[PDB]
Amino acid sequence: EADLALGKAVFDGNCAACHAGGGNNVIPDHTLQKAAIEQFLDGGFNIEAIVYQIENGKGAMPAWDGRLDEDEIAGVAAYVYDQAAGNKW
Ligand code: HEC
Numbered sequence: 251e252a253d254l255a256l257g258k259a260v261f262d263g264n265c266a267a268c269h270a271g272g273g274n275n276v277i278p279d280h281t282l283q284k285a286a287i288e289q290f291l292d293g294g295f296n297i298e299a300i301v302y303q304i305e306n307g308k309g310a311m312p313a314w315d316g317r318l319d320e321d322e323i324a325g326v327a328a329y330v331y332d333q334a335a336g337n338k339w
Pocket residue numbers: 261264265266267268269274275276277280281282286287290291300304308309310311312314318326327330
């Protein structure tokens with residue numbers, strides 16, 4: 251599901267610290283656009299993957315399974331996925 255209203259509100263405080271504007275801090279190449287996600291998200295460019303990765307915490311990335319609820323797990327994923335797909339980053 252998701253509503254961008256909520257999803258971005260989380261992003262701003264939670265994700266942006268690394269991925270501000272579809273960026274990174276730790277790995278300045280792994281963004282959140284499709285050219286990154288397609289290869290660097292184990293599972294490839296899918297919402298279900300992003301859901302099932304955001305919670306699990308791939309590599310040098312905090313696991314969100316206990317921070318981000320069945321709501322914002324959907325919320326922020328949907329947000330970044332839209333940006334990614336659209337080129338709206
Ligand atoms: C810095 C402490 C991070 C925070 C905060 C978040 N992410 Fe991240 N993410 C980070 C890194 C270094 C990586 C790559 C790890 C590796 O093994 O090299 C990622 C990866 C992602 C991906 C997959 C695509 C990619 O860039 O490799 C996605 C879809 C992603 N991250 C989403 C995401 C969201 C929505 C966050 C807030 C809930 C978030 N990340 C925080 C580092 C960091």
